Structures are given as C-alpha cells and as structure tokens.
Amino acid sequence: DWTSECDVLVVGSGGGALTGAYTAAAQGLTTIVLEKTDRFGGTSAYSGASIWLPGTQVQERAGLPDSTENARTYLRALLGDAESERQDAYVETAPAVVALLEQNPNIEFEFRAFPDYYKAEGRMDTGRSINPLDLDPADIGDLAGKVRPELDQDRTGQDHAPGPMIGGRALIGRLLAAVQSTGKAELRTESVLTSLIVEDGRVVGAEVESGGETQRIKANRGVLMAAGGIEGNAEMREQAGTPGKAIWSMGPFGANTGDAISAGIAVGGATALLDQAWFCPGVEQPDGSAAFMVGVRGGLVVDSAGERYLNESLPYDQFGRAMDAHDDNGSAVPSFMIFDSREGGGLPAICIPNTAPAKHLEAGTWVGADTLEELAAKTGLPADALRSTVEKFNDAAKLGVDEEFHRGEDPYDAFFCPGANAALTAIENGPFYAARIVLSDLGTKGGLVTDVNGRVLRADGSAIDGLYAAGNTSASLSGRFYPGPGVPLGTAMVFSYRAAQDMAK
Template sequence: MTEWTDEYDVVVVGSGGGALTGAYTAAANGLRTVVLEKTGLFGGTSSYSGASIWLPGTQVQERARLPDSTELARTYLRALLGDAEAERQDAYVDTTPALVAFLEQNPNLEFAFRAFPDYYKAEGRLDTGRSINPLDLDPADIGELADLVRPELDQDRRGKGHAPGTLIGGRALIGRLLAAVTGTGNADLRPNTDVTEVVVEDGRVVGVVATHNGNTVRIKANRGVLMAAGGIEANDAARAEHGTPGRADWSMGPIGANTGDAIAAGVAAGGATALLDQAWFCPGVAQPDGTAAFLVGIRGGIVVDAAGERFLNESLPYDQFGRAMHAHDESDSGAWMIFDSREGGGLPGISIPNTAPADHLAAGTWLQADTIEGLAAATGLPAEALRASVESFNGFAKTGVDESFHRGEDPYDAFFCPPNGGANSALTAIENGPFFAARIVLSDLGCKGGLVTDVDGRVLRADGSAIDGLYAAGNTSASLSGQFYPGPGVPLGTAMTFSYRAALHMAG
C-alpha cells in the first residue's frame, strides 16, 4: 500500500479555467480539494485568453435578450459536427445553463455577453455569437491571490508581472475562480507541484505522485483525480510522434509548461487517446526570438505563399486560417503577409504579443521596401506574381467583391474591420508605400488531443470501460469538436463544463 504524504477527496492537476471550475465545484460540494500547478503561477493558457466562453443557452444570454437556447446550440453543433460525439455534444449544451447558474451564485463569479460571431455558417449559428465573458476584475478585490495569476502573454514572456490596472479576459477569469475556490475554505492551492504519475490500486486511481520543490510527495484522492493540465503543445518530441503540425516555440501556451505530462500519466494508467495530431490552430506572426504571436482580426493586407500568390481568405476565423495554411503546405516554411503604410507601418491586425515594427525590421522577421517589386526582391518572392496578387486584390477592393476567396462575405470577416469608404470593409487596397512583408507561421492556442473521456469526464480505456477514479478535461482530453472550432470559447467552455460534470460525479 502507498505511504501517503497528504490526503484529499479530490486532486485537481492543472489550474486553467477548466481545472479551477472543477476544483470550485468539488470544494463547494463539500469535498476537500487540492489544486496542483506545475509552475509558480496559476491559469495556464486560460490566463492568456480573451476569455470568451462558449456556454450557450444560459441566464447570461437571457439577460442580454439573445435569441439563444440549448436546442439552437445543439442544432449548430449537430450541423457542424454530425453525430460524432453526439452524447458529449448533448451533455455539453444540456449542462451549461446549470453550470452558469451554479457559478453565478458565488459573488466572485460574474459574466456578461460580449458579441463575437460563431465561426461557421451552419444552421443554429448566431452571427452575433453566444459566448459569455467574465467581468473585469480589480486586483485589489482578490488581494494576494492576484499575484498568483499568470500575467498576460507579453508580460509573462518578458518575465514581468501584471501591467498596472484591471485584470481583464483570462486573468479576470482565473482571478475570480481562485477567489471562489479559496473562499470555500475547503481547498488548497499548491504551485510548483509537478505530477509525474497517478497511483492505481486494484484497478482504481487513488492518488498521484508529484515533485514539489525537489521533494517527492504522494497525495491520496479518496474520490478521484481530475487531469486538466493542458496538452502536448510545448513538447516537440510528442508533436513529432503524433504528427501534430506546427512547433512548440510557435504555440501560445506558457513556454515549457504544457508538455503532456498529465496525458502520459493517464496513458500509463490505461487510458486511451485520440486526436493527438490536432490543435486549436491559428496564424502566428514570427517573432524576433523565434516564438510566434497570435494573429487575429485581420483588417488589411493579403497573405501569399512562396509563389507570391494568395491561397486563402485572410479574414477567416483563426483555426480555419491555420488549417488552410497546413492544407497548403505552409506549416513549416511559413507565408508572408503583405501590407502597406496605411496604419503607419503597423500590422493591420491584432498581434498578441504586439512587438514593435522597428524590432521586427531589425530582426528580419519583417521586411520593408518602397515598391512591391522591391519587397519581392527582399523576400525572394517572384516579383511578377506578387505584383499580380496585389493588383488583383486592389481590384477586388474597388468592386467590393473578392472573386478569388470571398473575403468579407461572412459576418466574421468584417467583425474587426472599421469602415473604409468602400463596399466591403474587409477589402482595403494595398497602395500606400512603403510596403511591408511579415513572416507568418502556423501557430496554435494549444493541442486538442488527449485522453478519451465520457460524458462525465471519466477517462476511458481502449475497450470503452471507464477507469475508476480518473477524470480528464480541457486539452488533456480529446475534444468533442474533432477537427472543428465551432465558436469563440469552445476550448474554455468544454473544459469548464466537463470539469464541472466530473466534480459532480465525484461528489455523487
């Protein structure tokens, strides 16, 4: 029998939005709970996010008087995903109203609707979106807990703490959840605790082995272990093994944190895996230090391949953009975004982090020239093809119709685009020199393959039987959305929902 260092009812591995939702649910239901975080800060990739959360048909949408419902959301998922994972699709949308009602009973947890369109034109879609967001948070409201929240991506990569002012987006979500978890008086937070294995006795998972400040600890879990610690995004060896496009350096997860340890521990306990070649893809702006910045909200310019030709609608939702790069074999070599000086030499899109143009130009990740032909020479692109691509696009900008890739025809395309005086705000001519080329690579917001789970987050063996006492959610589990990214906040929404269901299953 294992000699235990500590004993709890529930052990939660990870500290993102899903993990902390599970921890709060367990603790609020009377279960002694511990949250084990590998690093010194809580929140993981969730803290970097804008914290749109795809939790449809809830009281938040009702307050905003949206025409949303559980059935409409179910219709949208079915239209997009088909009958694959139908049981988990149903469990997801059927649970979200109760989840949000439960969370909002806690004064620390407040949400509001913020418009952001669903990503696919399919029956049940809402062009305004249906995602909800946590309210911004004054760090003074949560005291010392604010120091435990992982800062925004740019600050974190530079080794700095939070910028002065309000916590927004993912930082607000994590701060609020930490306050809710600790406010139960029934939970402990343990940073710098790296789980290396789960302990199985008589076919049941009964605890974990971890390293804490150089010491080995064995923590008993009387009710269960919830693995919600990210995917394999920061592990190049695992990505190569499973054929996951992109690179660890280009991923948006905390550098070095999400290496698939929780997935490996679940596999060692007998868990099956799926979708390990998949990720929540996005275009990334190549950075001077070899990393990438999340690119979203493109409002100008075009993207061309090595032949100097456009190959996609540049205003696509980011996952579809990334998949188009991979399908066009631009996963490793990257592509070029061509834009002009209309915004003072700045990128016509949102780059997170937003490195100064001068730093890009000095490093060679951006190139500049007075003419399109000069830009072609600088990048090595065929001058005639690049000139033709720009002239063709400029013609589309005048007519308002992108005859090649239909940019601007979907509500998402124009969501980030201010009026430009033309018929299509997503089409703005490239004509004001000097001109710029920014290297674009295939990035991701995390990998979406992992342990196979059921409707209650229980980890399943290859034969479909559940491993008693072991649960998984978020990017540690295989996503129900397969190769699709249905709408803003589906990664967070599914992580929170199935962590909630897992905790209720343990409490039950």
C-alpha cells in the same frame, strides 16, 4: 506512505481545473489543486476568456434570442454525429455550470458579441459567448499576484500591468477567489504531477514533485487531470504528427508538455485526435516564437509562390488549417502577409503579444521596401507573381468583391473592420511590408478519451475508476472544428464540472 489526503485531487489550474475544484469544494469535498509552475491559470490566463456556454441565465439577462436547442443544432450541423453524446452533455450542462459559478460572490459573467465561426444552421452572427467581468486586483487580495500575467507582460519578464484584470486574468483571478472562499481547497504552485497511483485497478492518488521532494497524495473520490495538452512538447507533437511547433505555441513556455496525457496513457487510457490543435496564424517573432494574429482588417497573404491561397479574414483555426492544407514542404509555412503604410507601418490585425514593427524590421521577421519588386527580392517571393497578386487584389477592393476567395462575405470578416467592402482595402501606399506568418496554436486538442462525465476510458471503452480528464488533457468533442469563441474554455469548464459531480455521487 501517503503524504496527504483529499477527496478530489485536481491537476492543473486553468479555467476547467479551477471550475472542477470549485464544484467539488463548494459541496464539501476537500480539494487539492496542483499547479506545475509558479503561477495559476496557464493558457486560460492568457486567453480573452470568451466562454461558449450557451442558453444560460447570462444570455437571458441580455435578451439574446438563442437556446440550448439552437446551440445543439449548430454543433450537430458542424460536427455531425461523432461524439453526439458529449455534444449533448456540453450544451445541456452549460446552464447549471454558469448558475453554480455565478452563485459565488466572486464570479459574474456577461454576454459579449463576437460571431460564431461557421455558416451553419444555429450560428449566432453576433455570438452567444460570455466573459467574466473585469476585476480590480485589489478585490482578491494576495491572489492577484499568483495569477499568470497576460502574454504582453509574461514573455518580456514582467508581472501585471496597471489596469484591471481582464480576460483570462479576470477569469482565473475570480475562479481562484471562489475556490479559496469555500474553505475546502488547498491551492498549490510548483507542484508537478509525475505519475498516477493505482490500487486494484483504481486510480487512488498521485505521485507529485514539489520542493525537490516527492509526495504521494491520496484522492478518495478521484483525480481530475486538467493540465493542458502536448503543445509545449516537440517530441510528442512530432510523434503524433501534429502540425505547427512547440516554439510557435501560445501556451506558456514549458508549462504544457503533455504530462497528464502521458500519466493517463501509463495506466491504460486511450487517446485520440493527437494530431489536432486549436490552430491560429502567428506572427513570427525575432526570437523564433509567435504571436496570435486575430482580427485581420487589411493586407493580403501569399504563399512562397507569391500567390493568394485563402480568405485572410477566416476565423483563426480555419486560417491555420488552410495554411497546413496548402503547405508543401514549407511553401505555406511560413506565409507572408503583405501590407502597406496605411497604418503607419503597423500590421493590420491584432497581434498578441504586440511587438513593435521596428523590432521586427531590425530582426528581419518583417521586411520593408519602397516597391513590390524589391519586397519580393528581400523575401524570396517571385516579383512578377507578387505584383500581379497585389494588382488583382486591388481590383477586387475597387469592385468590393473578392471572386477568388470570397473575403468580406461573412459576419466574422466584417466584424473587425470599421470603400465598397470594408474587408477589402487596396495595398498601394508605400513603403510596403511583408511579415512572416507561421502556424501557431492556442493549445493542442488531442488527448485522453473520456465519456460524458469526464472519465478516462481504455481502448475498449471501459472507464478507469477514479480518473478524470478535461480541457486539453482530453480529446476534444469538437474534432477538427473550432465552432465559435470560447469553445476550448467552455468544454474544459463543463467537463471539469461534470467530473466533480460524478466524484460526488
């Protein structure tokens, strides 16, 4: 009947999942971690591993003037009372999560400056998020080769490049080492959750595919599903009304297809926010995929009418949401980023992965021209509107003020730029370029409804015993907002920890 048995079954291997697994395994509960693909970490591995866990011992070490209450105030100011109990659990539990994790020899974080994303009471203009320290891959042995590589390697048929493991690779490599060190955890790759097993109304285990064979794994205390969102599943996204496209998602291709959300729905779990994502502008690639565009430091962006319609320096989720709001049957998706040869043909932003300009020009995702009139012809933009847009923006750059969209009036805008306003630079030294910008995502954020301890709830608010969800398998407490750097990982980690604690009671 049962192929194996454990106390805590964890589905997925991102930051949340591994934090849940660690929490369970470190207090003596036998734990099995199931990863679908041949690598641990998912999108978490791709990430910069900024983590929004405020008011902890990490920020105390840095002498940061902030607190749990200040962070609570910020969330409340942005999110309102919707999900206030989960907002409270999120900020209140951050210190304990960080304390537990840093008690492991394989884990250490530090504060790294990066501004919160909205002007509101409680905002930190320099940020409050933390990051794992760089990791020498030699220091975790055979685990390094099981961590998913960064986007710049993973989508070009490559494994890790020669430096240290940084960002998400450090996060996942350190979490894995921690989980392994407990001696209470079994880490499996190529093991796919297919359905949950329910007895007398309680989730008691799961059915799983690996090795072509199907298995049944018993979970005495519970199942934590932290297996990502629906971002890779075009059908679910289209049914939910999610903007963007699977092909533009920055999740690992084919990994996060909503399997855990579906398995949860099948046993009665309610869902929410399925039309929402962690949005970002994406630089369209030759193969139809996208690259995360972050840290804009020049150029401007136009809709298909050749006009500016947003502050290009906006945090990525707000940028993406403005694309979607402006879009009318494709007038803003794609949009076009217009820039000159100031950076030798390079686009003035950080693009992940970072495809050379020559490949884009060869494929036609970018076009270049000696004049704006010619650029307009090649892109389908109106020449007069485009010329007029650029002249107006260049006047704004001269004055150092953008009266139309107020670019360069916020610490986030200034943060990425080294004239009168560092964020406003004239577009004037040809050749000129236009890059297609699409509506990408860093995962979706809709999913199973959960309570403050990660328990999956039915439509009436009752808890499905034995079943927990966190990360993008769960509907985010953040609703339509991306409050600052590290919220996706921070929420994932806090609720995975709380789920494991609940299972331990």
